[PDB]
Amino acid sequence: ELLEEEQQGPVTEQDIISYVLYPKVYEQYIQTRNQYGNLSLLDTPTFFFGMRNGETVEIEIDKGKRLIIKLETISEPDENGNRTIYYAMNGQARRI
Amino acid sequence: ELLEEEQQGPVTEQDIISYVLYPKVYEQYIQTRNQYGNLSLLDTPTFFFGMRNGETVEIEIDKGKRLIIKLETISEPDENGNRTIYYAMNGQARRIYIKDENVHTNANVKPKADKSNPSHIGAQMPGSVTEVKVSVGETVKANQPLLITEAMKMETTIQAPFDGVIKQVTVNNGDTIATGDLLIEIE
Numbered sequence: 001e002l003l004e005e006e007q008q009g010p011v012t013e014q015d016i017i018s019y020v021l022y023p024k025v026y027e028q029y030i031q032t033r034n035q036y037g038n039l040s041l042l043d044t045p046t047f048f049f050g051m052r053n054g055e056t057v058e059i060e061i062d063k064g065k066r067l068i069i070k071l072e073t074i075s076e077p078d079e080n081g082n083r084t085i086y087y088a089m090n091g092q093a094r095r096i
Numbered sequence: 097e098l099l100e101e102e103q104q105g106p107v108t109e110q111d112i113i114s115y116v117l118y119p120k121v122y123e124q125y126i127q128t129r130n131q132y133g134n135l136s137l138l139d140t141p142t143f144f145f146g147m148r149n150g151e152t153v154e155i156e157i158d159k160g161k162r163l164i165i166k167l168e169t170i171s172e173p174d175e176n177g178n179r180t181i182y183y184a185m186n187g188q189a190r191r192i193y194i195k196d197e198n199v200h201t202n203a204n205v206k207p208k209a210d211k212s213n214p215s216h217i218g219a220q221m222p223g224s225v226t227e228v229k230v231s232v233g234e235t236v237k238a239n240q241p242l243l244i245t246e247a248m249k250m251e252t253t254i255q256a257p258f259d260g261v262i263k264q265v266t267v268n269n270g271d272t273i274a275t276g277d278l279l280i281e282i283e
Binding site: 052053054055072073075076078084086093 | 149150168169171172180182205207
């Protein structure tokens with residue numbers, strides 16, 4: 001009940017023991033997954049380090065599905081302390 | 097007859113005595129006018145200083161006609177020392193390339209070599225370029241020295257892996273190099 005109330009929907013028997021065995025950790029894994037998604041798919045050097053300027057990285061999402069990302073530049077922090085990363089993803093200009 | 101030949105076509109009487117009076121200066125005014133447009137329309141602070149990161153500026157072109165320009169970011173220089181300015185003009189994304197007058201080209205970022213491409217020669221480890229021995233469009237033998245780099249008070253020359261022609265040299269004398277930097281391309 002508790003997991004199906006926190007997450008609101010699908011919960012497996014794997015989720016249940018995972019929570020019982022590691023309450024704090026399971027929960028924290030969900031918060032991270034909610035934010036960044038499936039991090040297993042990223043390659044290790046991209047996972048630990050991110051990306052350099054003018055780099056292109058492939059991420060195999062499925063059979064014949066993959067993300068193509070190019071990191072162009074990163075801006076200087078603004079007044080709020082926020083930097084603008086200029087991206088190119090799947091032939092589409094993107095800003096984060 | 098002279099001025100109309102040089103320029104596009106339209107020349108006024110005011111153009112003519114402006115030349116006569118100040119030949120070289122008038123001819124310079126035209127070269128700048130052809131390069132940058134009408135600078136007198138710029139506000140003075142912008143005219144002398146350009147723009148700071150994140151600044152929005154207005155240029156009164158005429159009644160109801162103005163340029164709203166925002167300077168978003170200035171990139172690090174490429175191997176040629178060309179910085180990419182990220183602009184916003186009248187709600188349109190815009191990119192402009194400007195050559196940086198460095199002094200020493202140690203701020204230049206070289207693209208990484210493609211390790212699967214045999215044409216691409218990459219830097220084995222970090223150093224500085226001591227001597228460039230080839231230029232673009234030069235046929236070279238196998239084992240021919242084509243770049244001398246210094247690591248840690250140690251010189252190690254880079255040589256051609258096969259017979260071929262140089263497509264690009266991304267480095268000049270005194271430039272810093274990093275592990276994996278593209279340096280040469282050959283056929």
